[PDB]
Each structure stands twice: as C-alpha cells, then as structure tokens.
Amino acid sequence: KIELCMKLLDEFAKIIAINEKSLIFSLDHENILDWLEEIGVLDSPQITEKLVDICFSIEVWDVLTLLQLDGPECHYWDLQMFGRFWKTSLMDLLDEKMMKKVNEKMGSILKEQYDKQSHVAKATREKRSNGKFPNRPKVADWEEQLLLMHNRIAGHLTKKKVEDFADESTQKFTWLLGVCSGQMSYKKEVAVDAEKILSRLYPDAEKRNEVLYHFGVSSILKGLDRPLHILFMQIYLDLVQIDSKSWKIDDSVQKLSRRLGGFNEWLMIVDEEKREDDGGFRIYIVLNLSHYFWELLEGCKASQVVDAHAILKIRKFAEVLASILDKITFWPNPKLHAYYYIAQFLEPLETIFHFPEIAEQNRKVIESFFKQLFDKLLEQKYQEGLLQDTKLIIQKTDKYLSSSLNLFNEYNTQEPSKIYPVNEIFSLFCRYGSENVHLYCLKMIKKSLQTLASNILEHEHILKGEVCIETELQKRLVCDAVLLTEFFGYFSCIYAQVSENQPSEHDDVAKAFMLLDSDIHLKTKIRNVFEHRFENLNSNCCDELKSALNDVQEEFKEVQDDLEQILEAVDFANQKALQVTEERLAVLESFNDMDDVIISEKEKFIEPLESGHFLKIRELSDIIKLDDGTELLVLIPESIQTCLQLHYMDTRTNLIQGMHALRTETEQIPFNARSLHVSGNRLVVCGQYEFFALRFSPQGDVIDRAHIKLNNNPVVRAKFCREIESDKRRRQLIAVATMQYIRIYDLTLHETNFVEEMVLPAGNVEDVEIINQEDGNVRILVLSSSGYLYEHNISVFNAENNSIFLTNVVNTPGMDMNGDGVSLHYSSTFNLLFVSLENGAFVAQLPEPTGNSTAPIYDWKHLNIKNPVDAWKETSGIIACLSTNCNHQVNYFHPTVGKILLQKTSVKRSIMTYFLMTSAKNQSVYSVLIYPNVPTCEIWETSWNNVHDLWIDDVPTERYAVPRYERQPILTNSNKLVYSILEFATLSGLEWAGNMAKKHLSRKLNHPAVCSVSTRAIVKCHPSVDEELFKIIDGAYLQEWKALIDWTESEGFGEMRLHHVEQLLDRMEAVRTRWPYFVKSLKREFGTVTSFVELMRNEMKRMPLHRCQMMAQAIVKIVFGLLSNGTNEAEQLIHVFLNIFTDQDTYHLANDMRSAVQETISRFENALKEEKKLMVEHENMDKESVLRIKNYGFSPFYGAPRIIAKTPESMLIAKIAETIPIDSEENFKWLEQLISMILEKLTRSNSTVTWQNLSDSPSYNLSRVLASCLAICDPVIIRNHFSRLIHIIKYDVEKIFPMSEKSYSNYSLLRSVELLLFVCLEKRGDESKENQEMLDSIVHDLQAVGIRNLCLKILEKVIPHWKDRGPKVWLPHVPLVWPSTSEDSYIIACTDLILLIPQHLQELDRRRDDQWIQKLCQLASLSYRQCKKLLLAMC
C-alpha cells in the first residue's frame, strides 16, 4: 500500500506542477496529513521525500501563479530556480540600477510571450490580473487551500531534532536551505522554525551565511544546464561583481570557488554527455568574468597611483583562474566556433601573467594547458566541425575563381568575425609559452608536415584557379593552407629567437648594390610579415631546442617536391588571373543574338555595407578620380543654390576612415544649379535657361570654365561626349537638350556658336545620348514624347548655325504600345542601349551605321520591368538606375554571358541622391546613397561572397604602413603560403631556395615580400660576388622590360601597366653600381643598345602627355651614361636620340625632352661641385681614404659623385667598376660628337614647315639643348664650336627673309647664335685668363663677321610690314599651370631675334649710328620694352 501512496503523491505533484484541474482539489486536501494518519503510515521515512517533492511542486506552482504566465511552456527546473531567485536574502545585496534592469527585461520577455499567445486565455488573464509585475494578481479560493495545506506540511517536518537533517546530500536538506532564507510561499512561522533547525545544525553564523550564499549561487548555476538564460547570466555576473568587493587578501582558492558557486566541481565534470549539446555556458561565464576583470586591470594600468583594492580583486581572480586553467580546455564545442574562443582565451592568460608569482607557482598547469590547446589544432573532429560550420565561407571572384582562399571580411559585423584565427593562437603560444611548449609544438609540426603538404596537393587543380569550391570536402584545402603557413612562420620566428649569427656580409652586398626595393627608396625599422614576441623563454637551455629545429630541417628534404609543385600551381594561378581578354570578348559577343538571352533575378549581387554620418531631378552628385588615387565628390547643396560643393576624400587606405576625414571646398557658380553631369574629368551644370561647364586639373584644381546663355524652351538635359585616348584630336563636344531642339557645342571651336541644332517635328524631347565613334563621326539618339527614337550622325564639323529636321526613325520598342519616353542610356563597355518608357524598359545592341538616308533595324528585349526609370549611372561592369514613380527603390543590372542579372532593392527611407564608384582598393564596387537626415549616407557594396569584378582593371591594392606609406598589392593567403615556404627554405636548404627563387622574380606577378625573399635567397646562395649573380638579377629586370611589347591595349589592364612602368623607371637607378655588367646584359638580351633605346622611345608615346617627363629623363640619363662611358654604337645611338625630336610621330614631345636635358645637366653640376669640395678636404688627408670610380655608369647624372669614401661596400663596388687616380681630369669627346651632330642636324633639317607657336618647334628645342650642353664644356671647346657655327651662316638678306628653304635654316642658326651668346653672357663673372681670351676672341670674330649690318638689313624689311598690316576657346588638352597668320608670327619672331642679338652683343662687349637709332625709335612708335631697353643701353 505504501507504493500506492508513493504513486498518488507523485501524480499529485506532477499534476499540480502543470496547473491542471483534477478532482483531488474538490476533496478536503487541506488536512492531507490527517489522511496519512488514518492508515498510520505517517511514520514512514520514505514518504517524506515525496512530501518535500510535493512542497517543491507547490512552490513552482506559486511562482507560476505570481508570474501571471500559466501553461507548461517552461520546464520545471527553470521556474524552480526562478523561485529561488526571488526576495530571498540573495537579493538583499543587489542595488537599484540592476533591479530596474532586470524588472525591465523580464517585463519585456513576459510581454513578448503574452502577445505570442491567442485571444481567449488573453481575456482570461486580463480579467484575472488586477495589475502588472510585481503586483500579485487577484486571489481565488483554491490557491488558499493549496497554501494552507502547504503551511500545514510543517507538522510532519519535525522529524526528531537534528538527526534526520544531518545528511547534507538529501533533497530534504535542499528544501530546508530553501525555506530558511527567503521562499515567499512559506509563512513566517515556518521560516522561524527553519531558522531554528539551521541554528541547531550550524551553531555559528559565519558558516551559516556561507552555506546559504553558496547554495543560492549553486542553484543559479545548476539551473543553467538544460535549456531568460541571458538575464540569469547577467545577474550572475552582477552578483559576482558585487561580492568581489568583500574578498580578503588571505582567502584560499577553495573558499573563493565556494563563493562563486560550485565552480571547481562544475568545471571539472569532463564527460561525453556534458560536452554533447551544451551551449558552451561554462566558457561563456569564464570569458565574461575574465573580460570584466581584464578591463578593470587595464584601466588600473594607466593610472598614476595603484589602488590596493583593485589589485587585490585582480589577484584573487587570477589565483582562481590559475587553479582552474587545466579544466576549461575540454569545454569548447567542436561543432560551434571552437577556434574563436580558443583565440579569445588571450585575456585570462594576460591577467594571470600580470603577476609573476602566480605564473611561477603554476608552471605545469600552464604548460599542459598550452599542450592541449595545440593538440586541438590537429584533431580530426575539430577540423571536420569547423569545415561543416555555416559561418566559414570562402570568397569567390570572377578573375580569381577561388585561388585567393580568402575567408575574412573586414566589414562583417557578426560575432564570429575571425572564425579561424590560427595566427592569434600561435602569437599567444609565442608570447606566453615556455620551452616545453615549444618543444612539443616543434615535434608535432615535424610529424604533420608531410600529411599537410599531401592534403594541400590533393586540390592542386583548384589551387590553380580553374574551378571554384563547392563541397565541404574541398573547403579542407583552406583549412590546410593557412595552417601550413602558420607552422612555417612559427618555425622562422623561434629560429630568430634562439640562433644568433648575423653574418652581415649578405646584408652588406644587398646594401652596397641596392638590390632591395625598400633600401632603394630609403637611399634615394622594417616590419616583417610574421611578428611574434617571446616573454617566457630562458636562454640557458638553448641546446636541446636547436636539436628539435635540426630535426624539422631534415624533414624539409622529404617534402620539397610537393612544395615545389604547389609553388608552381600558385604561380600558374597568379599568371592566369591577369588574362581577361577572352572572357570579355565572349561576354560582348554573346549579346549578338537576342534569342539566347534571359534576365535572372535569382542572384543577390549587391548587399548593404554600412550606414554612416559623414557629409524632380535626382542627378545632384557625382565623382571624379584623381591621378594619385584620391577622389573628388561634386554635389549641389540645398541651403545655397549659387555654389558647388567639392569634397576630397582619401579612401585608398580605408573606406570608412577615408570618408570620415573629408576636405570641404566651395566653388562659386553664377546661377542656381538644377542638374549635374560628369564625364571623365569635366562637368556640366544645368540651370534654368543657361548652363555652365567646368574642366579640372589632374591635381583636382579647377582650370577651365565656360558659361553659355541660350515660346518656351528651358534646359532639360545636357551631357558631354565620351573621350577616347586613341583620338589625338580631343573635341569637347557637349549636347544640350531643350523641349524643342538639340544643340551641340564644341568648346574647341566656338563658345557661343553651336556646331549643329536639330528640331523635333511634332514632339517633345525627353533624353538625348551622344556616342563618339572610332571613325570620327558622332552618333546621337533622341527620345521624343510619343516614344519615337530618332538617330542622327554627324561627319562634318563647322561652327556654323545649322538647323535640321529629324527624319530618321528606328523601329520603336513595344510596337503599337509605346507610352511616353522617359530615359535613354548607352553602355559603352557592353555596347548596349537601354530605353525606358512609361510601360516598361527595353534593351538592344547598337547596330553598325548604314547611312544618313536609311534607318537601321533594332532587335529589342524586354528587361522584365514595367515602372518607368529615369536616372542612370554606370561603373565597372555595373549599371544602376532609379525608378521615378517610387522614392525608395533602385535597380541594378549586370550583363553576363547570355544573361542580364537584375536586382531590385528597396530602402525604408526616401532617397535624395546616389552615386556609383569603383573602390580605391580596386576590389569591389560601392554605391553611396545620400539622405537629408542625421544618418546622412548609406553605402552598399558588391557582395563579398561572390564579387563580380571581370571589368575592374587593377589588382587589389592598399597603402600599407611600412609614418611611411607605400602602395602595395594585397597579400592573399596563397602568396603568404608561398612566402612562408620560401623563407623556410632559405633557412633550411639553401641550394633549393636559390634554385626556386630564380623563378619568382617578376614584380608584376609576385608580391613585394616574395620578391624580396627571393633576392635575399639568391644573394645568400652566391657568397663570392661575380658576374653570375648580377647576370641573373639583371636578366630578370631586362625580361620585365622586354615583356612590355606584348602588353598591347586589347590585353586589358591599363592602370596596372602604368604603375608597373613607373616601378620599372624607379628601379632603373640601382644599375649605376654595376655598369659594365648591365651593359653586357643589355647586349646579350636586346642585341644592340639602340634596340633598348628604341623600346624606351616606343613606350614613351603610350604614356599620358602629362606624365611622360619621368621617362624622358630616364632616356636622357641612359643615353648620356652610355656616351660618357664609351660605346661602339655612339653614332647610331645619338642618331636615334636626335631623330626623336624631329620625327613625325614624336616631334610634339620635343618640348619635353629639352626640359629633361635641362634637368640632367643641373644634376651633373650637383655632382661636380660636390666632388671638387672633396678634392679640397682630401688635400690635407691620407690618400687611402677615398676612391674615384672610372666606370660610374650614369652616377653623376643622378647627383651621386664619383668620389666615395673607402669603406667595405665601396671596396665591393670598386672591385667591379674599377678605379683611377683621383686627381684625373675630365674628357668630353662624347659631348663634342653630340654637339657636332646636333649642328649638322640643324643645318640639314628640312625647312618651310609653318608653325603657329615657335617656342614648341623642334628646332628651337634643339638649339636650346645645344646651348645647355655648351654651358659646361671647356672654354677652348666653346671657342672652337662657336667659330665653326659662325662660318656656316649665310648673310644674304633677300635669300633668307620671306619664305625660302634656306630662310628657315638660317633663322634656326641665327637663333642658335643668340642662345649661345645668352649662355656666354653669364660667364663674365669668371675671371680666368682663358675665359677672357675666349670672350675677346668671340667678340672680335663677331665684329669682323659683322652681323649688326645684317640686323639693320633685316629690320629695314621688318618695319614696313608692321606699319602696313600690324596694329577664349578651350585647348584640346588641359592647360598645365595680333599676330593673325603664320607670316605675321614669323615676322614677330624675326623682329624678336634680330633685336635680341645686338643687345647681347652690346652687353657682352664691355670694352651711335644714325640708321640704328632712327629704325629703333620708329619701330618703337609702331609697336616694345625691348626697343626701350635697347635705346637706353645705347644712351
């Protein structure tokens, strides 16, 4: 019968715990203790357990009643622990703010559960409840019975005096502890009885309160095992923080763990069941407490005075953490983000190691902790769980299919930012690990290297960038590569910590010959790729470490073939990434037939990035690119409409930081601006009736302006024309639309005159598109009001007001349905035309032109869109447009092979404006939306997981802080792996490292770090500096130069090629230390030096006109060096160097090269003037302290002198370049040849080439370079060459004036004479005897020849023309910052020369003709300052 009562009371407890009505309540259960007395089983000890179970169930029922919740939607233990959470003395210690917080949170979750429920029980609850929390709802009748019998239970709970409750491991003891402190349902009599029995159990009060507190926290902890958990976590942290203020300095770790709950026993439960399905609550608690104490510690670090209490707190928590460290390793869930929390373990170790005493007393624990931590990295289940994780996603782009192996998004805001932070874990190992940890790690790496390499090579076909990553097995590849990389890096770091050799000779060679790019930029500390610090290593026990390292090195001999194979695969991937021509051709050709094209809206290729606060017609903002990578944003302000806002932003180091730091400027505009358009580098502002045009400089400063004022016909649209780099004739065509007509303005012909005007027959314009064909003809398509599309093409260009009736109509889209036309767009990259009408949109491929009389046939495809769309923008492969009937949605188009990806996005706010932009790091496409309110801007980006960058013409770059800042390509994971392999090889096996480094030397296919380690490896391989080392290096450089031929325009990447040529030009300098070897390499590669100079000349033309100065300087420097050092092709080399000036394809560049020479000569002086001073200081010094280089290359032309101090690296250089006595004089025979052939070129040049500007003529530049060269020769040389030049002049006057072929040659020679006199003038300061003798000889020669008479004859013919006939159009290129005809300019130039010559003759001749003064005064009256100064000097 006893078992029957056990079952009855158990069923009673279960049924009440679920709040379910049963017939038992109708009985008089208040005297249930009477019932048991009827049978007589009240003496049964086994029934009291079920009685206290009944009491517990009634308690949780009471908690449910107070909560006003009802229903068994929460487990029994949750509510039970929530009951123990109440007004019990555990919350006598809590403060008001946390009380408000917890009340608010439980109210919010209760309200959420409430609105989760249906209506009927909602009405029942609302009727039942008289108030919200914490007021108890209304009291019914049956709860009174339940409570009354609950309190009456106390009668059976006598159970003798103390002996029943002496057993601590009983349920009745837990109940007794619960009633003693604060259980609400129990009345005060029961509470005082419970307090009395506890006093009998524990006479003292200290242990009483200790066990009460421990029970409370252990209950709050044990309740968190079987899923409001976040709130309970938070209040646990709050209770711990409160209690931490009462910890004594002499407390034991066991007592402190007791105060925290059952902490030591809670974390020591290592069982499979506990690990399975746990939410990692233990590590959450440990990390939260550790992070709070770490924030406290780091806050106390910066203070000036140490706070004893805070230090005591941190110390006690550190002791606890040290005691428990060896247990927390087991808990991280392999199927969760185990590695993230493994990395997050950094703070507890930091605060443990802040105190050296704790770390010293706990050494074995720390070592075992780190050993298991490392063992976790190679465990199979952990790796499989990480692979199966849904947050591990590998980036996939269009060029690099998956070869980049990128797994980190810097702009992802989710909690697991770094799912696989192996580097942070290894850095922690390096920072705090001891010697034994390093030994274990080295052994494990040695064992695992071969398997890791084989697993990598299993997926070589996917490391080569041929296919993408699909399955979860293939992701293993990434989990290998990173791991392998880190292993090697770790090895290298430990080597640098334990071995001290520093040979200093390889560094000496690399510094002397400047083979390293960073050293070149320094001479014209560094941070390594892997940086780990060691703080717990002892140097007295190094030897065994060395042994381990040696073992690892031997392992490298067994795995080198696989490493070479993966290096080959990665190089193949890098080379393949830059070949995009065929993909683009296929994409463009795929649109030829409209029968095989679809529109897909299933792919989301644009995703939001971030909303920030940085700053009808919606074309109010646009962007312009600058040369140095900075960006200029132009926009129309709202407050003032008579100004234009310009913002300079620097987003090549970070987008967010770059947009934060803005440079604001205001440009005043005459009128209010309605619309804004930008093409390339110029912009058009559309006002009410007039419009404005601006053109900017490459530095971002405004250069050119043009204000144009034009029934009713206001301005509708206006846009520039697409410019072509191939078109030398740069026409600034702009099309302006008005409701009746289209006008075309050409800012290179006339500002107030339009080339053409076309008026619509019976319609209204809505949009106009202008297209610049390659032939030169310009196509224009205009969208009428009815929807008709009219196409015209222009072939002849004249600034004549012509009017045309538009009568060419193409097959209109949507036959017999077309609404009112809305917009037109033309994508030049894809050769596509978008037409947006009222009823929908259409796309077509622009067909080849046929004529001005017929009409072409268009094939149209519907874009699966109906609403009208107006504002269009285009960037790298990406088209965007703004729908007009709605103020929230944007549409994005991306054409792929035979399809057009479409995405329609909507934003919750009304949009003001937007603009597209290609990232300054060249890795994604951004779209910035500008709003009026406080969140001023939002930024969207191309989706990270699948980036569509087929049409981006650069590789990702960054401004890395090597503060020094350098533009370097992004270091992918594959290249990091390659660099790690190479560095480990240079450390371990030198022959293999040298053999492999010779393959990775091209700078256009490899990261700078890879090239640097390859050069270091090659240097180390050759210990004796010979011709072979420089032969290898300069062969790589010269092949890089030679490869420029194949990199034509259709090959794609344009900006990368430009920066690549700049890099080559910067690297050219270092050759000056090995000149004979470089000459030999040049001869063996190109055959002849003239071929190399021809290649440089060919590359000069392709460069933009405002950047060609650097390579002109390079050509001048190399030619001068070759001539100075002596070559057997001097004649042909000078021949081509001069032919550059006068050739049909290069004469426009003459003005550049002259300036280049005028720089080089100056640099030459900066050499010579230096060397002379060294001759002085060395006069009273030992002869064995300086050296003179006899084969200096072009070192003087670079400003470096030929006299260098005697140092070991100088000895290295002199061993190669040879030396001569320091006091040796100079030789200028090469200059003699240069001048002689320049003079011959001037004389034999073909004349009668008319010019509008004489300062840009080739012959003027040749004369100027002759003068600059003669300014440094020996005085006897000047005398000889000037005397030779003088006698070539023919002084016949009728034979040289008007137009004769000899006339222009004579003019050129006379100009040369004037320039040489100008040069000779400044030498009057020199007081040398030879200088005076040469000056007097030249003056006497000029007097004897008698050119002043010739000046009179020329002036006598010049003046009559001045008496007879004598008294803002944009340039094709951006301007850097009377007369009427060719004859008039020729006469002006003749006057200038023929007046300048006698003035210089008079000035130089420091030892009154009537005709002279008469002609001078007369011509002065006709004209000016030259005449006045000439008469003034005559007087």
TrEMBL record:
GO terms for biological process: DNA replication. Keywords: Coiled coil, Metal-binding, Zinc, Zinc-finger. It comes from the Eukaryota. GO terms for molecular function: zinc ion binding. Residues 542-583, 1154-1181 form a coiled coil. Belongs to the UBR4 family. This is UBR-type domain-containing protein. It comes from Caenorhabditis elegans. The lineage of its organism: Eukaryota, Metazoa, Ecdysozoa, Nematoda, Chromadorea. The gene is ubr-4.
